[PDB]
């Protein structure tokens, strides 16, 4: 007895984006008098100069709720069209139901696939490659995707090597199916012989502490860049092969927001001519992990340094060690 | 300027499974000196004798990895061919890495894509489907899928309506490339309107409180009870459908393993012939959530209630709310 398939037939492509930062702006100046280390190290070592982080009533939910919404409105899709959303995070501190459920009950989704993925900062790059592989097999229509992350919750603010690199926020993208390739083949993988570069604290050890709550991120800045400036920047080149471009081709490269000497180092590692616009959003937002890429893209677009129909490289690479990217046609 | 996606061809099939549940053997006797109940009571309402918890040395870590070996060995792969592992867990108390992560580096696999999916209950199927997409569109070749759960750490105790229902262990699947559609399109959906049905506590929730270490499960079995005959055996009928099959070419059907009425109601409603095996192994296992169909896959070809190359339905449904099925061939 034979089993029927739903065909491969046509692609997919971003239709619209949404962000939602948190509300409260910390600057250098602020986070010095929370750490011991001075404005002037921190955005030479990092170019950050600040960053967002969440208030009380700004949870992973209602952050990702409200990029999704205006990706929603900006979509021109009715909520009862969307049949699948993705979250991508690793602050969703409930073990079930998934954020993504609590996120379509907000937005009153009717009949849609709903699931978590943890691919640490990579998950944005993660999410939208099942998301075009979905499209493309029939399993979903419109693909509601969505990155979102509270790390200062995590934060050791008595780690002056990690303290003033993390941020909040949710960025959203809505998927649709295409006539012509929006979404280029993702180059995704990992290192996990390198685990113990990023590892955060279980949730049982930090909930048998009395002294504190959320478990904290510890990180090798050192090993991170060296890998980062090493392996990443080779499966970033690949992302670009594999869409059938060279870097020239790119309109913009948005990398996920780690470190500028980063970003910089894998930019000349792909010989990106001066066209190529090269996301800096690290300036005022420091690194908010899945939610990174997202954000910078419906940001970049906002202030016009990136255009509906460019060609832009994006990519994640976090814990794990993990890592994905893909060249995709913005919206 | 364009961009290309990766050549499609062909399909995918289960290569084989594996599986390793907790140790600890807790019988309905046991359970009635921690709860006020009593064994009968509880084998009337769910088929429930005996669950399986871990002993504090068997994590979800090392009950995934063992699941996943025994897989691996079965399949004829070297660890080195796997290029994508998927986990599907609500039990990885960890913020980062992944689960998937861990799993990998004991397995010594090499450059795979890693990433843990929450899909409640239903997140093995959530986990296949995907799979099955990613090995179509060509982004992985051999995919390793584990469901993993370790549930009696967050049962309540003091709840005499749920702390007989949840079990620990983990059930392994590897996925490969095939000339011939071995796995049937997925069914998958949610109904977040009815996310208050199953709710586990927040870790933040559980940190706080000086006699607490684990968030703990809360559950309005009645509510699930209705929903799961009413619209998860309608979805259950679909996943056949889909599969161009009709429920008298099953040889087994494998749903979720949370209440033998459920499994009744759903077999009734899809009007299986005699012919048709079903899965009633809660009678020993409990509710594993996202380990419990690979688990009861992998225990019924070993007892031989099931055969290679049987076509099975598989079903998952659980908190969000959320499911996931479809058809597939058995290794
Ligand atoms: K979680
Ligand atoms: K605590
Ligand atoms: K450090
Ligand atoms: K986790
Ligand atoms: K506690
Ligand atoms: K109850």
Known sequence: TAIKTRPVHGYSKFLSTGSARGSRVVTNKEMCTLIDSTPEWIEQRTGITERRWATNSETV???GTTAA???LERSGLEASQIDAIIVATVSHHRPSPSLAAYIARELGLGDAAAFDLNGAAAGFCYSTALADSMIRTGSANYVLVIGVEKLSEMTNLDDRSTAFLFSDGAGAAIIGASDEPGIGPVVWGSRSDQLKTI?????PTASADPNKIHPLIRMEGRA???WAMTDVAKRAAEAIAEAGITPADLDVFIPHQANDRITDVVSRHLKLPESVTVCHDIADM????AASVPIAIDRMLQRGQAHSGDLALIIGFGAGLVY?????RLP
Chains 1, 2 share one sequence.
């Open 61 to 63: 939910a209602s952050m």
């Open 69 to 71: 919404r205006t990706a």
């Open 199 to 203: 590892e955060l604290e279980d949730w």
């Open 224 to 226: 991170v860049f060296k």
């Open 286 to 289: 420091g690194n908010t992990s």
């Open 324 to 328: 994905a990217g893909q060249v995709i």
